[PDB]
C-alpha cells in the first residue's frame, strides 16, 4: 500500500505545484488588459454568452421546483405568503451560486479544457512560443479573466430568473396574492448582506472552477484520448471543489 501511496502523494503535490506555477506565471503583468480587449471580448462570448441559454432554462426550472416544494410545505402552516422569502433566500444562499457553478463547470468549464487541450495537441502553443509570444499571457489569462468576470454574472441571471419562476408557480399557478408575495419577500430577507454573500461565493466558485479548467486543459496529454480524460477530470474535480468550498463558505457566512 505504502509503495504506491507515497508516489501518489508526491504526484499530487507536484500537480498542485504545476497548477500554482501556471496561475502565478499567467497572472503577473502590468500590460495585461490593454491591447487584450479583442481577446477578452471573444472569450466573454465563448465562456459567457454561449453558456447563457442553459443558465436561463435551468433557472426557470429550479425556480419552479422550489416554488412547488415550498408551497407544499408552507400551505400546512398557513405561511404560503412567505413562499417569496423562501424561494429568494434558498436561491441567494445555496442553490443559486452552487448550481450556477456546476452548470458553468459542465458547459463552460469543460469547453475551456477541451479547447486548450486541442490547442496543445495541434501544437499551437509550441508554435506560439516559437514566435516569441508567451502563451500563458496570450491564451491563458484572457480565458481566466473571462471566466472570473462571467460566472458572477451568470449567477445573477440565474437568481433573477429563478425568482421569476417561483413567482410563476406561486403567484400565477397556485394563486397566492402577488402583493403579499413580493412585499413579504423584499422587506423580510433581501438585505444587502445576502446579495453580497451570494456574489462573494460566486466569485470564489468562478476562480476555482476556471482555474481547474485551464490547468486540466493545459496539463493534459496531447493525444486525443488524454483530452477526454482531462475533460471528465475537469468536471469531476470542479464539482467536488464547488461543493466543498460551498460547505466551507456556508459555515463561515451563516454562523
Amino acid at each position: 500500500a505504502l509503495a504506491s501511496l507515497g508516489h501518489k502523494g508526491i504526484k499530487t503535490l507536484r500537480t498542485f505545484g504545476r497548477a500554482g506555477l501556471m496561475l502565478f506565471n499567467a497572472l503577473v503583468g502590468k500590460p495585461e488588459f490593454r491591447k487584450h480587449a479583442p481577446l477578452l471580448v471573444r472569450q466573454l462570448y465563448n465562456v459567457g454568452v454561449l453558456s447563457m441559454l442553459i443558465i436561463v432554462v435551468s433557472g426557470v426550472f429550479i425556480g419552479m421546483v422550489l416554488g412547488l416544494q415550498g408551497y407544499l410545505v408552507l400551505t400546512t402552516y398557513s405561511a404560503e405568503t412567505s413562499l417569496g422569502m423562501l424561494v429568494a433566500l434558498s436561491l441567494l444562499r445555496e442553490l443559486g451560486p452552487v448550481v450556477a457553478a456546476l452548470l458553468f463547470a459542465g458547459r463552460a468549464g469543460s469547453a475551456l479544457t477541451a479547447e486548450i487541450g486541442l490547442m496543445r495537441a495541434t501544437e499551437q502553443l509550441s508554435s506560439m512560443e516559437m514566435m516569441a509570444v508567451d502563451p500563458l499571457r496570450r491564451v491563458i489569462s484572457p480565458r481566466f479573466w473571462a471566466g472570473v468576470i462571467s460566472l458572477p454574472l451568470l449567477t445573477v441571471i440565474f437568481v433573477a430568473v429563478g425568482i421569476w419562476g417561483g413567482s410563476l408557480v406561486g403567484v400565477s399557478w397556485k394563486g397566492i396574492d402577488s402583493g403579499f408575495f413580493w412585499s413579504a419577500m423584499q422587506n423580510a430577507v433581501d438585505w444587502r448582506m445576502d446579495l453580497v454573500n451570494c456574489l462573494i461565493k460566486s466569485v470564489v466558485f468562478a476562480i476555482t472552477v476556471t482555474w481547474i479548467s485551464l490547468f486540466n486543459g493545459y496539463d493534459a496529454i496531447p493525444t486525443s484520448a488524454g483530452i477526454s480524460r482531462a475533460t471528465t477530470r475537469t468536471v469531476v474535480h470542479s464539482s467536488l471543489a464547488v461543493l466543498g468550498l460551498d460547505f466551507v463558505l456556508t459555515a463561515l457566512m451563516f454562523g
Partner: protein, 143 residues
Amino acid sequence: QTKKNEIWVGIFLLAALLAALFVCLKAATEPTYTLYATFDNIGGLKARSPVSIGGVVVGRVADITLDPKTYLPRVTLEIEQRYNHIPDTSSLSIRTSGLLGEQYLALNVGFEDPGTAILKDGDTIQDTKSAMVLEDLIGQFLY
C-alpha cells in the same frame, strides 16, 4: 464574425444588469436625530429595528446597551427629521409584528397642553413599556 461577438457580449452584459436591477429592486440617507429610552425588558429588540407611529416606519433603532451603573437596557433610536412635533407625553411600547414576526418599537404621540415641550435631538423619552414575556403572562392568566 466579430461584431456578432461584440453585440452579443453587449446584450449579455445588459441582461446581467437588468437581472441585478430586478434583484436589487425586489430587495428593498436622511437627516435624523437620536432619542433615548431605558426600558426594563427589551425582549427581542436588536440593532436596526424599525420604530413606527401608528404602523408607519419613522426610523430605525441605533443600538442597544446596558446602563453600566443601574443595569437597565438603555436603547437609543434615530428618527427622521420630517416628524418634528412629537410631544413629551409620548410613550414607547415594544410590540411583536403579528404573532411570530420580529419586534418593533410602537411609538404613539400624546396630546399637548395650551408643560408639554417638543422632543428634540438628544432628548430622552420618559414613559416606556417593556416587552411582554410569555411565562409571567401565562402565570397571570392562570393566577
